[PDB]
Structures are given as structure tokens and as C-alpha cells.
């Protein structure tokens, strides 16, 4: 169960980074002063957002850009909680055994 | 199992911070305006990136610098998921027992 939930989350995270990159540019163009407006740097912004690093070099200023950002965040965080929970499950079993 | 995976991750993380520091400078010099260009501050940037703190004082502006940054991030995050999963495994056993 756990590994499949984790693997799926990883696949789902990759999809969210790419879709999030596309949707962030769509949301932010048309807002004066917005910088999250070209796709290559938007993919970079989605990665530093999903990992929760959040340098501050780029960020959304619109309502829809910010909603996209929160989905990226939660997708990243969730994937990591799942990988962590999966590692714990693995270890717990190998330790029962040892 | 768990402690060795954790210990190894810690050793591997130290290697990634040093190699990441070297590779980030290599990637960023030659890009006008880049600031992640000397080794001492690049090691500092790798540490605040791996812990996901990400102050924003320094960051990569090139494609390869950013790929290096994502490896540092994932190495940091993974090490911590492993330590956490290791602590859970330890506790779970001592509690079966208690």
C-alpha cells in the first residue's frame, strides 16, 4: 500500500509542477508588475515552492496565481509526508523482523 | 536497517552540500548578475537550501544552477524524512516493549 501511495504521489507531484507552471503564467500575465510570467522560470518557481524552500526570487501577485501556488505547496508537502510515512512503514517491518 | 539508512543519508547529505557548493559556482559564473559565485557563501546557500529555510539572500539564476539546487533540496528533505522515519521506528519498538 504505502509504496504505491508514495509512487503515485511522486507522479502526481510532477504533473502538478508542470500544470502549476502553465497555470501560474496564465494567471499572472495581465497583472502589472507580475514576474511569474514565462514558463521556464515558472517551472523553477514551482519546484522551490513545492519543496517549501521559497527563496522569494519569484512569486504570484494575483488571486488565481496564489491559489495555484497553494495547490503546488500542498502537493509537495503531501508527497513528502507520504514518502516519510512509507519509509517509516518499511523500517517498522524490517525492525519487527531483525 | 533504519539507522543505517539514516546515517548513510547524513553522510550523503554532507557530500551533496560540498559538491553542490562547487557545482553551483561552476554553473553560475558566466551568468551576468549571478551572486552564487564564490565557494564559502555557496556552501552557506547549500545549507539554507537543504534545510528548506531559503532566506533569499542567494539563489541560482541559471538552468544548471537551479538543477543543482533541486538536488540539494531533495537530498536535504530525504535525509530528514529518513531520520524521522528512523525515530518513529525506534519509538515504536521501545513502546511495544514498555
Amino acid at each position: 500500500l504505502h509504496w504505491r501511495a508514495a509512487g503515485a504521489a511522486t507522479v502526481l507531484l510532477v504533473i502538478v509542477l508542470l500544470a502549476g507552471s502553465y497555470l501560474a503564467v496564465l494567471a499572472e500575465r495581465g497583472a502589472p508588475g507580475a514576474q511569474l510570467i514565462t514558463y521556464p522560470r515558472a517551472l523553477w518557481w514551482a519546484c522551490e515552492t513545492a519543496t517549501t524552500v521559497x527563496y522569494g526570487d519569484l512569486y504570484p501577485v494575483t488571486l488565481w496565481g496564489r491559489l495555484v501556488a497553494v495547490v503546488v505547496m500542498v502537493a509537495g508537502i503531501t508527497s513528502f509526508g507520504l514518502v516519510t510515512a512509507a519509509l517509516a512503514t518499511w523500517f517498522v517491518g524490517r525492525e519487527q523482523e531483525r | 536497517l533504519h539507522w543505517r539508512a539514516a546515517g548513510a543519508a547524513t553522510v550523503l547529505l554532507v557530500i551533496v552540500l560540498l559538491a553542490g557548493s562547487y557545482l553551483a559556482v561552476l554553473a553560475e559564473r558566466g551568468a551576468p548578475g549571478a551572486q552564487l559565485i564564490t565557494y564559502p557563501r555557496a556552501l552557506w546557500w547549500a545549507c539554507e537550501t537543504a534545510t528548506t529555510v531559503x532566506y533569499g539572500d542567494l539563489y541560482p539564476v541559471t538552468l544548471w544552477g537551479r538543477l543543482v539546487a533541486v538536488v540539494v533540496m531533495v537530498a536535504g528533505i530525504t535525509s530528514f524524512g529518513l531520520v524521522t522515519a528512523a525515530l518513529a521506528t525506534w519509538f515504536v519498538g521501545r513502546e511495544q516493549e514498555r
Epitope: 502553465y22 496564465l26 497583472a31 502589472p32 508588475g33 514576474q35 514565462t38 | 551576468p32
Partner: antibody
Framework: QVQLQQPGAELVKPGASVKLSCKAS????????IHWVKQRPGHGLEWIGE????????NYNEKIQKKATLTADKSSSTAFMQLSSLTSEDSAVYYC???????????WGAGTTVTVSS | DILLTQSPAILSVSPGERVSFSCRAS??????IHWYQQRTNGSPRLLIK???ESISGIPSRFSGSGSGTDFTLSINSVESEDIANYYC?????????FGSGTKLEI
């Protein structure tokens, strides 16, 4: 082959409207945006607006009076700019240009010379 | 919105000489500047992207430099075919904007 094809000219009476076209060929991606640029004789390049065909959303220059409405047809790979209620101030060459979502205009159409006159 | 100032508006050089066009942004835009050449009655043509990157098909004669607020387009050894108007354009913040253009005279 020519990546963006535009008609050479359009004559428009003051107050009437006209719909300019820009037929695209070559590689097409979901990240493409088509932009329109206005250039009066002897003057510079003025950005009018952009549209992303894959989604149909358009943005416009807020600094100027809005004379344009952008649309795009996916099946005919054609982008359109509806100019309405024109005056002589609207007489100029209007170019369409393609941007691959990375900020620069890789290719430009030949431009349509629009003359507003009776 | 970002203002791009190109000055002087007219640059006169002697054949074969190195010439440089200036583009100054009203605020720092990294290296998000692109340059176009527009010959008389022609449409604009991209020459350099992201301040210094080459475009295939463009003579090696052209190059770009700068970051922040000050950018330069240089032509090593100008020749007649370089006679044209040159424009810079930024893509750092929305909306994209253009400089007012510099004409090269030989």
C-alpha cells in the same frame, strides 16, 4: 516557410471596425502566445496585447485606449484582432508575432497596413 | 511598467568600426532584454535574446552584454546591411515593453 501570414492591407472608414488575421504555421505548442504590435509611420513599436491560443485568454496594454479584441481559432491556427470604431490615429502597420512563452518574439508577420480614411 | 530608454536615438559610425547601442531600464530586470533589427519597410527581426544569447542565422558580428538596468548591443565592424532601426524589449515584468529605438547611420 513563412511562419505568420498576414494580409497586406485594410482600408477602413472612420468609425467602422475591421478584423485582422494572422495565420500561423511551423511548430505549435501549448505554451505559445501570439502578440500584436502597432507601428505608426516613422514611429516605434507599441505593444497592443497578447492571446494564448491553447486557452483563449487575452491581455491588453493598459496604457492605451482599448481598440482591440483578440481571439484565436485552434483548428485553422489563426489568431484575430478586431479593431473597432477607428479614427486616423489608428492608421498604422499592425504586426502579429509569436512568443514561445519565454519572453522574446522569435518571429514576426509582415504586418497589415491599416488606413482609416473615407 | 518598465520604461526602456534608448539614447542616443541616432548613431553615426564609419564603415568597419565597432558600434554599441544603449538600452537602460527604469528598474533592474536581470538579463531579460532582447534586441531586434528593423530595416526600412521590413519587419522586426530578433538578433540577441536574454541580453547576450546568439540566435542562429544572425551574423557573429552582433553581440550583447549587460544585466540589471544597463544593456548594450554591439556590432563589430559595421557594414551597409546593418543600416536599420534597433529596438530593445524586456520580458521581466508584465506587460512586456519596447525601447524607443536607435537608428544606425553609416
Amino acid at each position: 516557410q513563412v511562419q505568420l501570414q498576414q494580409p497586406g492591407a485594410e482600408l477602413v472608414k472612420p468609425g467602422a471596425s475591421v478584423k485582422l488575421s494572422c495565420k500561423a504555421s511551423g511548430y505549435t505548442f501549448t505554451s505559445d502566445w501570439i502578440h500584436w504590435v502597432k507601428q505608426r509611420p516613422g514611429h516605434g513599436l507599441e505593444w497592443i496585447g497578447e492571446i494564448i491560443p491553447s486557452y483563449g485568454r487575452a491581455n491588453y496594454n493598459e496604457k492605451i485606449q482599448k481598440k482591440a479584441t483578440l481571439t484565436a481559432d485552434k483548428s485553422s491556427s489563426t489568431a484575430f484582432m478586431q479593431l473597432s470604431s477607428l479614427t486616423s490615429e489608428d492608421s498604422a502597420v499592425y504586426y502579429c508575432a509569436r512568443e514561445r512563452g519565454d519572453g522574446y518574439f522569435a518571429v514576426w508577420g509582415a504586418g497589415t497596413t491599416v488606413t482609416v480614411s473615407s | 511598467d518598465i520604461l526602456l530608454t534608448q539614447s542616443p536615438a541616432i548613431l553615426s559610425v564609419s564603415p568597419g568600426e565597432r558600434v554599441s547601442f544603449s538600452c537602460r531600464a527604469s528598474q533592474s530586470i536581470g538579463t531579460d532584454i532582447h534586441w531586434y533589427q528593423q530595416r526600412t519597410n521590413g519587419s522586426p527581426r530578433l538578433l540577441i535574446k536574454y541580453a547576450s544569447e546568439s540566435i542562429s542565422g544572425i551574423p557573429s558580428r552582433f553581440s550583447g552584454s549587460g544585466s540589471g538596468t544597463d544593456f548594450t548591443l554591439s556590432i563589430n565592424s559595421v557594414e551597409s546591411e546593418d543600416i536599420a532601426n534597433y529596438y530593445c524589449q524586456q520580458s521581466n515584468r508584465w506587460p512586456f515593453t519596447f525601447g524607443s529605438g536607435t537608428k544606425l547611420e553609416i
